[PDB]
Amino acid sequence: MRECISIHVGQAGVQIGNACWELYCLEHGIQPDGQMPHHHDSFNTFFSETGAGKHVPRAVFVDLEPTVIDEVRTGTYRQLFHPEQLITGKEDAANNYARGHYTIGKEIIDLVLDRIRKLADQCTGLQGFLVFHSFGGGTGSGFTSLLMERLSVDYGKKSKLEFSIYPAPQVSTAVVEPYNSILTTHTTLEHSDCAFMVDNEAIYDICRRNLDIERPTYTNLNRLISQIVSSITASLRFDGALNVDLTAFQTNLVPYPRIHFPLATYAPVISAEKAYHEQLSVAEITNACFEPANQMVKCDPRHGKYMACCLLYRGDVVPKDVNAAIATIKTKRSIQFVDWCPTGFKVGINYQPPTVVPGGDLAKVQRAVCMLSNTTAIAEAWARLDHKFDLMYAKRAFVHWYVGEGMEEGEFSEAREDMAALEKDYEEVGVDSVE
Amino acid sequence: MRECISIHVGQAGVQIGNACWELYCLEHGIQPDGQMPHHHDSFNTFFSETGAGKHVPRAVFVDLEPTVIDEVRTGTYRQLFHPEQLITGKEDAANNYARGHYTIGKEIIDLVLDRIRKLADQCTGLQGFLVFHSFGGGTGSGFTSLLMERLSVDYGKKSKLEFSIYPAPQVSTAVVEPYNSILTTHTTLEHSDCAFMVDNEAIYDICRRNLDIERPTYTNLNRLISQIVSSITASLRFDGALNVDLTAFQTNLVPYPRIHFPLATYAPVISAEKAYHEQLSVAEITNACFEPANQMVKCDPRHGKYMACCLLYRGDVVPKDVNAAIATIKTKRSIQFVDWCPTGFKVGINYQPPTVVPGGDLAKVQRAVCMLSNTTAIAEAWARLDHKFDLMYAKRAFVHWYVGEGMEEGEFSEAREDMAALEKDYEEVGVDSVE
Amino acid sequence: MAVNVYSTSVTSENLSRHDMLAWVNDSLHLNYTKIEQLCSGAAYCQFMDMLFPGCVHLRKVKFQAKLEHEYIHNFKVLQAAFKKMGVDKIIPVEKLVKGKFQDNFEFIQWFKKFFDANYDGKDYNPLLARQ
Amino acid sequence: MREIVHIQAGQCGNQIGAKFWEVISDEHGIDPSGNYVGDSDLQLERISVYYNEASSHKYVPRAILVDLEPGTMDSVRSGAFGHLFRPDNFIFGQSGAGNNWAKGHYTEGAELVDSVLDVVRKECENCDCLQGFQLTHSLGGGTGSGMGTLLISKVREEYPDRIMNTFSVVPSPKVSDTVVEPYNATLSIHQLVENTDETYCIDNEALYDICFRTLKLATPTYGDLNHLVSATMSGVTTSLRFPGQLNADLRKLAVNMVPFPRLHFFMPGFAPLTARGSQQYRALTVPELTQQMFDAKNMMAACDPRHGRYLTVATVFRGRMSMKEVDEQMLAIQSKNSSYFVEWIPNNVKVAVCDIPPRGLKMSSTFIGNSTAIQELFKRISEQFTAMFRRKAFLHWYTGEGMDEMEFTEAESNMNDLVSEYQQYQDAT
Amino acid sequence: MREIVHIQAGQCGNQIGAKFWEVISDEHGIDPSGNYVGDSDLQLERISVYYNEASSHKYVPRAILVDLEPGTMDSVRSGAFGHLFRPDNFIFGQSGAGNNWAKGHYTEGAELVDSVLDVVRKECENCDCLQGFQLTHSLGGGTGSGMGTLLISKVREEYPDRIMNTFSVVPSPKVSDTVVEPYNATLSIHQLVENTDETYCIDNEALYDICFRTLKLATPTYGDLNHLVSATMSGVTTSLRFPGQLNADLRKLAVNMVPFPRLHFFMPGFAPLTARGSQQYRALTVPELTQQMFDAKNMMAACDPRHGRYLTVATVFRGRMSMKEVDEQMLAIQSKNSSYFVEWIPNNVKVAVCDIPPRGLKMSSTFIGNSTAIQELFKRISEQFTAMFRRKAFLHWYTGEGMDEMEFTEAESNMNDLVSEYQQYQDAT
Ligand SMILES: Nc1nc2c(ncn2[C@@H]2O[C@H](COP(=O)(O)OP(=O)(O)OP(=O)(O)O)[C@@H](O)[C@H]2O)c(=O)[nH]1
Ligand SMILES: Nc1nc2c(ncn2[C@@H]2O[C@H](COP(=O)(O)OP(=O)(O)OP(=O)(O)O)[C@@H](O)[C@H]2O)c(=O)[nH]1
Ligand SMILES: Nc1nc2c(ncn2[C@@H]2O[C@H](COP(=O)(O)OP(=O)(O)OP(=O)(O)O)[C@@H](O)[C@H]2O)c(=O)[nH]1
Ligand SMILES: Nc1nc2c(ncn2[C@@H]2O[C@H](COP(=O)(O)OP(=O)(O)OP(=O)(O)O)[C@@H](O)[C@H]2O)c(=O)[nH]1
Ligand SMILES: [Mg+2]
Ligand SMILES: [Mg+2]
Ligand SMILES: [Mg+2]
Ligand SMILES: [Mg+2]
């Protein structure tokens, strides 16, 4: 009765979808063939039910290149997905926001909107859309921008969360990431009800340091992101001592309409060999969360301010211990709050412990914590992109690919001033008041 | 709930740590895998407890050469330790205080401080730190000096005990021990709340004479030092007729802030073959303690004065016999007290008898005694080092290694004047006052 | 920039309770009679003000503080000032806020050491800063 | 005779209500199925105050459960003591107010307020002689705060002369469980000061401190805190559902405890409270309870009464005890405590006594304190409000639901006026 | 009627208190579970002096246990006769004062003094008619000395007209169990002379000598020494908890034994004391006890009374005796030792007689002696104080906790003034 659909755009989006839906199928005891051999109907959120015992997910996998979609189709999770929600194009946007937003995206946007409308029309209490896309690829950025526009125009006021792969400061895979990232940020700034920044380099650092995996693959990063999203949706999908909804996320984390960019952190992240030797007290995991190393973005909060924080605990969590740990964090030195906000913590509790994936890397624990923090240091990251953009815009590099594709230089300018204005707004929010 | 953590610096620190933690695991009935198949939670002092029955030590093993740490990791006590506190460097300081205090020590000091803070933050009544290091190696001396600085700056007033391997008068293994010893002493003189000197030659002599082991190894010396440390911590870890805390040690043994260098002695030390044939009365073992041969430093107290003494008894000890023995000791001729201290005895009593390690060298006894004496003859030892230093400083030998590694000649000089000032302070304390 | 010091064990340099109380009273022109009242933290903020011009903003500190959260807020301001000047001595706010003799005296003696370290010889009126 | 309709709003409201109804079922000896398995007629002689007699000798609670998310309702239904509620009273929403007071009072609450009011109207018509209503909710979340404010406003506009109780959880001073609780608390206290005859301020921090210190529970779940809140509920209400050597009801406490219509913000307290092992080491006599009540560590509000003055003090007792002794302890605790009591209210203590102890315990008490210290609470919130109102922080959410800044200004002004009245009556002589 | 609150400070205080409460439980016939298992009503007719009657016919002692290290508290809890103490009274610190009087009186003791005083206040309010306080501590360790001094100060400032007893272990002359006990003893004696109505100086050396010679015990544990101290406690207090042909209490002994307010330092003694085998070889008659008391070897203080003068002497008896024989023995012992008693106090002997003998004995006694010989003790400590104060020995430890040298100087001056007063009153004619 409480429905919330997922939209995975781009190759990164589809791989996150693989991980997340593997985790969901494990959580609700669903075989890959859709059968079922602290729990309410918990699965009614993500899983719609047919006449038989088969359950199918309410998700849309869209990508212009058939590679990853064919891999999903021929993979183990073949019978599960309804064949319509595996939507494929012909040619990839190739790291070009132009190709993914004006020329190729339009050729299949109507089908995606139609399938989304079919999914929505048979729901009863749809809360919103979980959008998984990257800012690097042209497909992700451009098609996500177009889709957010279309959904906002079609659906009026529904929470639309973006779980993006923000481009890393130094470890980049493409060359034209700055252009695409600036364009997609400028486009989605007025549709993204709340966007959660995630960076690849920080997850690499976390995995090497904590998981002790000297050579991890994208599978593990997908596993961590799936754990994050499961922690986010645990309150909706399970009984909890203190429940929280998506609108609560959108309300407690966004002080100003233009500043809606929280960052995520998960704990604990320890291997089975290191599962013992330490008890995972709630204070311990909370200190691990507020430690700048366990953060999933290369931005250190200790040179900024915390506008808001949202902590979600799951498992055998004792609320008084929550209160004690939060007070101790409040007393610390590396957490200085902004002037206008004397109260920046939200707490949510769920009884259901996190679920361990067989063949995974983490260890089965009894308590888990996700921190969703809206802080000020993230603004610094934007500056870097701007600088890069300006450098790449100093000599008009790579501009022709966009220009000859249904694109104008004027939006490049306009996006640049919009990014500068966002930075100015962040800086203004940072400062303290008179009297 | 009464916690006290251990910090083992240098190869000697790690080996004495092996011995001490073997002794502890035997004392509290802990299998090497951390399970438990006159006692309070006695083990709660050294051993933190996990969700299961596994117990892990609150100690930090730090050493720049990974050899000894690998031996610990691959040894029998593998599963016991939490893998984080086995911290390794990459290259050893190589008997160079400069390398162990300015160049290499800085590269891992932050991790050590972070782990120490993590250990401390989950304690409740932390009393202090037991630091096991040598003055000979560059790693031990330099890194211990740096770590004492950082701990003093970070933690305000917690007792910090140093059980150092003081360089022997004639039996040396290095050539640059004087420089490192003076540098580390001058550095730690302002942070060592109490430093307990122990010498290798004296322990060799004790092992040859009493244990009748014609060819002892470092294992035996580590066993003796571990027995001393266990006798020190028995009052904290066990029920006693007269308990004593670390602050009591720091208070009763330090008359002047600069003179805080007691020496240790243990009794009885007799083999199983010689375990019989004598009843080991408290008077007998006390006489053995005050005998100059059983002391663990090559300094004979009969040419100095006793500023203070602290005797800890454990086992089936009857206090009246303690009083009678102490009176008889006071009556003897070879113990002349300083003028300003008419009462230089502290006594502590514990019910728990000493624990015998299987495969060891000592014999299971019913009474045991540790003598911790702050006397004046120890000053003589310092003079020797000074002479050596001046000799090695006469021709500027080995200076370039320190100079080209981030050290100033003025540091060597100021250490020399500070050491001479310490000798003058010892001398002026030694003399008697008028009227 | 400011230099930093420590306090472990020194003789002839540890000042008495009443002496330090008179020191703070004379340096801030006020009449504290209990040293644990310095759990309020206003005295520390005004000490930071006199130690470095600016470097703080006394409008947020609450000189009329009488509760625990007010103490926490004042100590947050103090921690911000400490971070600004680069002094890295982490302060134990959790024990200080309770207003108990031990940690307050420990903190104030360390603060006396640090204050003697970083003071020049300027003169001013504490009242104008206080109001 | 003298029936009471119980309303629960917000997740904390439903949880407190579930524990409360468990306590009442224990007191009146009712199975979860709803049958009577007691052993004394007195349990049934006033069963009608909270329970409606259905057919086949079955008793159902006269409770209304309101929320905007089905998770809480599913939790209540699934667990034990869930079958006795009437399934029609299970009114719930779908999306949840999302910690936003607008959706709880203007947007989402508007879609269920009509159904809730029809159910309340039906229950009022079905009851014999209505006494009043009591609401259990919180001021932190959007749902409970906004929906409770709306329901109280509509009900009092539907029933002017009835009395309405609210047991509202007030946010803790040190920590905040939410982020935008200043606005919600300000608006909710505004609605309460307009249209409530008394409220019992309750704070999670105070309950945590009491349970850790007095109860010696190192691991306190919400179960125990809700149990203490329910015990306070039952101790307040016991004077109406059972006889006593000095009978009282909600009206008597309201009249004695409210000297000025705006000042109706009270603090609850309970006694005795003992650890599991330390129970037999003490004789449960009247002066022990009296000395246990009048202290900060047993007050469920996060404000020391010695920061202010005690205006009035209500003490309800349960169990066979001598009246002279209760009177003597009240006289002594007033005489030795002349400083914290208002001078221009001679004999500022109300005493009520029942005959039925609270299960397992030989006798117990219940403390209601009308003191001005709570104004500090308001000041803190007020300050935080300004700190979050000066830069227009999170206001665009509440403006996007149609409300204006003028309500925020007016409500802040009214709370400041309430603080001023508390201060003035504190300074009266 | 005439209730006494017993406080225990330091590890010595807790151990002596444990043995003392065992002795009292034996006297009043109380199960360690706390039930009454006696056989005579007289045991219960004055049970309330030390025991509070909790519910279900259970009795719990009116004792408070204070320390800064949990080892002693755990030892008391684990062993037998441990379930009787009320669990909240087990007030203890965590780190221990570390033999430092500053931490016991200023730094650490301030962290528990408030809780201890609240417990004392609750007990005083709960008692019917308070008589006075008795403290068991030592002057050697930092914890017992400092905490006891602080508690005595605060309690007497809270209750001026009450009487307060201290049974403080004084360091032995031959050996020192600690190193810095001169300062601790000096400051503690300063506090005691300021704010105590009497103290019983007790020394380990004297008990060792007594047990070795008189008791013929070659292996005396602390159990036996604490047993003798507890027996002295019970013998002093027995005149209040049981009838007698000549009843007394603490007030009568305080008035008779203290001719000048400062001079309130006494020495205890017990009789009869016999070896295990030599018990039946001697008739227990009043004279035999009389010459057993008046001699150095049965004096628990390390000071020979023949070195000085006897100012006043209290003698308490227990067991069926003829009063004439007691009076004749007292007159004879005063007459034949006329050199040793002050001339300007004619009839300087107080006699009290109870009705109930002690354990496994037909009759027994208890000796309190106010004599000037103890001044030697003080002088010795004073000299040692100077010997450790002229060169600033260990002073920086007490300087680092905030004390000033003027405090040490003033305490030394007051102690020397006390020595001078003893000398002068000894030389009076
Ligand atoms: N963390 C993480 N990032 C991924 C993963 N897969 C792809 N990415 C990100 O995606 C970026 C590559 O661009 P994509 O968005 O995948 O491009 P696309 O979706 O294939 O669309 P085209 O650009 O037209 O090919 C890289 O910079 C990665 O950071 C993944 O499995 N885990
Ligand atoms: N008594 C005793 N002394 C030891 C033992 N192991 C090492 N030492 C002392 O340590 C000195 C050698 O220098 P170390 O401190 O071990 O040097 P290190 O810790 O390996 O660090 P580097 O100098 O950089 O290699 C010798 O002079 C020994 O006296 C031991 O097991 N027992
Ligand atoms: N005493 C007590 N308070 C509780 C308990 N559970 C929750 N609370 C309080 O209730 C508040 C939770 O917000 P609610 O008013 O319940 O909000 P909601 O009903 O979940 O509605 P939404 O916020 O829109 O999701 C928290 O701030 C807690 O302080 C409980 O079990 N006992
Ligand atoms: N008569 C008697 N005296 C004892 C006994 N146990 C300890 N003492 C005395 O008490 C003193 C012990 O010091 P305490 O006052 O107990 O110090 P503490 O309570 O342990 O506190 P810290 O010194 O800080 O550890 C010693 O000097 C002993 O002379 C005992 O069983 N019987
Ligand atoms: Mg692609
Ligand atoms: Mg080495
Ligand atoms: Mg809700
Ligand atoms: Mg002690």
Coordinates of C-alpha atoms in Angstrom, one line a residue, chain A residues 31-224:
Chain A
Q31 CA 14.0 -16.4 -5.2
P32 CA 15.3 -15.1 -8.5
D33 CA 12.3 -16.7 -10.2
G34 CA 10.1 -14.3 -8.1
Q35 CA 8.7 -17.0 -5.7
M36 CA 8.5 -17.1 -1.9
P37 CA 9.1 -20.5 -0.4
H38 CA 9.9 -7.5 12.1
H39 CA 7.9 -8.2 8.9
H40 CA 4.4 -6.9 8.2
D41 CA 3.2 -7.1 3.5
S42 CA 6.7 -5.6 3.7
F43 CA 7.5 -6.4 0.0
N44 CA 4.5 -4.5 -1.3
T45 CA 6.7 -1.4 -1.5
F46 CA 9.1 -2.5 -4.2
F47 CA 7.4 -5.7 -5.4
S48 CA 4.1 -5.8 -7.1
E49 CA 2.3 -9.1 -6.9
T50 CA 0.7 -11.1 -9.7
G51 CA -2.1 -13.7 -9.5
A52 CA 0.4 -16.5 -8.6
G53 CA 3.2 -16.1 -6.0
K54 CA 5.4 -14.4 -8.5
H55 CA 6.5 -10.9 -7.5
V56 CA 8.0 -8.4 -10.0
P57 CA 9.9 -5.2 -9.1
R58 CA 8.6 -1.6 -9.8
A59 CA 11.8 -0.3 -11.5
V60 CA 12.8 1.0 -14.9
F61 CA 16.2 0.1 -16.4
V62 CA 16.9 2.5 -19.3
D63 CA 20.2 2.7 -21.2
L64 CA 21.0 3.6 -24.8
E65 CA 23.7 0.9 -25.2
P66 CA 22.4 -2.8 -25.2
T67 CA 25.4 -4.2 -23.4
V68 CA 24.5 -4.0 -19.7
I69 CA 20.8 -4.5 -20.5
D70 CA 21.6 -7.8 -22.3
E71 CA 23.8 -8.8 -19.4
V72 CA 20.9 -8.3 -17.1
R73 CA 18.5 -10.2 -19.4
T74 CA 20.9 -13.2 -19.7
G75 CA 22.0 -13.0 -16.1
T76 CA 20.7 -15.0 -13.1
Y77 CA 17.9 -12.4 -12.5
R78 CA 16.3 -13.2 -15.8
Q79 CA 12.8 -14.4 -15.0
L80 CA 12.3 -11.7 -12.3
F81 CA 12.0 -8.5 -14.2
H82 CA 9.0 -7.8 -16.4
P83 CA 10.5 -7.7 -19.9
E84 CA 9.0 -4.2 -20.6
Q85 CA 11.0 -2.4 -18.0
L86 CA 14.3 -3.3 -19.7
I87 CA 14.4 -0.4 -22.1
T88 CA 17.3 -0.1 -24.6
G89 CA 18.3 2.3 -27.3
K90 CA 20.6 1.8 -30.3
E91 CA 23.7 4.1 -29.8
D92 CA 25.2 5.5 -26.6
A93 CA 25.4 9.2 -25.9
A94 CA 29.2 8.8 -25.5
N95 CA 29.8 11.2 -22.6
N96 CA 27.8 13.9 -24.5
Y97 CA 25.0 15.7 -22.6
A98 CA 23.9 17.0 -26.0
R99 CA 23.3 13.5 -27.5
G100 CA 21.6 12.3 -24.3
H101 CA 19.2 15.3 -23.9
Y102 CA 18.2 16.6 -27.4
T103 CA 18.9 14.1 -30.2
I104 CA 18.8 10.5 -28.9
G105 CA 17.0 10.9 -25.6
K106 CA 13.8 12.2 -27.3
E107 CA 13.6 9.1 -29.5
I108 CA 12.7 6.9 -26.5
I109 CA 11.5 9.3 -23.8
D110 CA 7.9 8.7 -24.6
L111 CA 8.1 5.0 -24.1
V112 CA 9.9 5.5 -20.7
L113 CA 7.2 8.0 -19.6
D114 CA 4.5 5.6 -20.8
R115 CA 5.9 2.7 -18.8
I116 CA 6.3 4.9 -15.7
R117 CA 2.7 6.0 -16.0
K118 CA 1.6 2.4 -16.3
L119 CA 3.6 1.5 -13.1
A120 CA 2.1 4.5 -11.3
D121 CA -1.5 4.1 -12.3
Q122 CA -1.8 0.7 -10.6
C123 CA -0.2 1.9 -7.3
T124 CA -2.2 3.2 -4.4
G125 CA 0.1 5.4 -2.2
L126 CA 3.1 6.2 -4.4
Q127 CA 5.5 8.4 -2.6
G128 CA 8.2 8.9 -5.1
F129 CA 11.1 8.0 -7.4
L130 CA 14.6 6.7 -6.5
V131 CA 16.8 7.9 -9.4
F132 CA 20.2 6.2 -9.8
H133 CA 22.4 7.9 -12.4
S134 CA 26.0 9.2 -12.9
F135 CA 27.1 12.7 -13.9
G136 CA 30.0 11.3 -16.0
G137 CA 28.3 9.5 -18.9
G138 CA 26.3 11.5 -21.4
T139 CA 23.4 9.0 -21.2
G140 CA 23.0 9.3 -17.4
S141 CA 23.3 13.1 -17.2
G142 CA 21.3 14.0 -20.3
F143 CA 18.6 11.5 -20.1
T144 CA 18.2 12.0 -16.4
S145 CA 17.8 15.7 -16.9
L146 CA 15.2 15.2 -19.6
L147 CA 13.4 12.6 -17.5
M148 CA 13.3 14.9 -14.4
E149 CA 11.9 17.7 -16.5
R150 CA 9.2 15.4 -17.9
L151 CA 8.3 13.9 -14.5
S152 CA 8.1 17.3 -12.8
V153 CA 5.9 18.6 -15.6
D154 CA 3.7 15.4 -15.4
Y155 CA 3.7 14.7 -11.7
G156 CA 3.4 17.8 -9.6
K157 CA 4.8 17.4 -6.1
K158 CA 6.4 14.0 -5.4
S159 CA 9.7 13.4 -3.7
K160 CA 12.4 12.7 -6.3
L161 CA 15.7 11.6 -4.8
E162 CA 18.9 11.5 -6.8
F163 CA 21.7 9.1 -5.9
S164 CA 24.5 10.4 -8.2
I165 CA 28.0 9.3 -8.8
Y166 CA 29.6 12.8 -8.4
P167 CA 32.8 13.1 -10.5
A168 CA 35.9 12.6 -8.4
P169 CA 38.5 15.4 -7.8
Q170 CA 41.4 13.6 -9.5
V171 CA 40.4 10.0 -10.3
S172 CA 38.3 10.6 -13.4
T173 CA 37.4 8.1 -16.1
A174 CA 36.4 10.5 -18.9
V175 CA 37.7 13.8 -20.2
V176 CA 34.5 15.7 -20.7
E177 CA 33.0 15.1 -17.3
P178 CA 33.1 18.8 -16.3
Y179 CA 30.8 19.9 -19.2
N180 CA 28.3 17.1 -18.6
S181 CA 28.3 17.5 -14.8
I182 CA 27.8 21.3 -15.0
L183 CA 25.0 20.9 -17.6
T184 CA 23.2 18.2 -15.7
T185 CA 23.5 20.1 -12.4
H186 CA 22.2 23.3 -13.9
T187 CA 19.3 21.4 -15.5
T188 CA 18.2 19.3 -12.6
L189 CA 18.7 22.0 -9.9
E190 CA 15.0 22.9 -10.1
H191 CA 13.6 19.3 -10.2
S192 CA 15.8 17.4 -7.8
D193 CA 13.8 17.5 -4.5
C194 CA 17.0 16.1 -2.8
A195 CA 20.2 14.8 -4.3
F196 CA 22.7 12.6 -2.5
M197 CA 26.3 13.0 -3.6
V198 CA 28.5 9.9 -3.8
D199 CA 32.1 9.8 -5.0
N200 CA 34.1 6.9 -6.3
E201 CA 37.5 7.7 -4.8
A202 CA 36.2 7.9 -1.3
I203 CA 34.6 4.5 -1.6
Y204 CA 37.9 3.1 -3.0
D205 CA 39.6 4.5 0.1
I206 CA 37.0 3.0 2.4
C207 CA 37.2 -0.4 0.8
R208 CA 41.0 -0.5 0.9
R209 CA 41.1 0.7 4.5
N210 CA 38.2 -1.1 6.1
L211 CA 37.3 -4.1 3.9
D212 CA 41.0 -4.9 3.5
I213 CA 40.2 -5.7 -0.2
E214 CA 43.5 -4.7 -1.9
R215 CA 41.8 -5.1 -5.3
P216 CA 38.0 -4.5 -5.3
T217 CA 35.8 -4.0 -8.3
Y218 CA 32.7 -1.9 -9.0
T219 CA 30.6 -4.8 -7.5
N220 CA 31.7 -3.8 -4.0
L221 CA 30.9 -0.1 -4.5
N222 CA 27.5 -1.2 -5.8
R223 CA 27.1 -3.3 -2.7
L224 CA 27.8 -0.3 -0.4

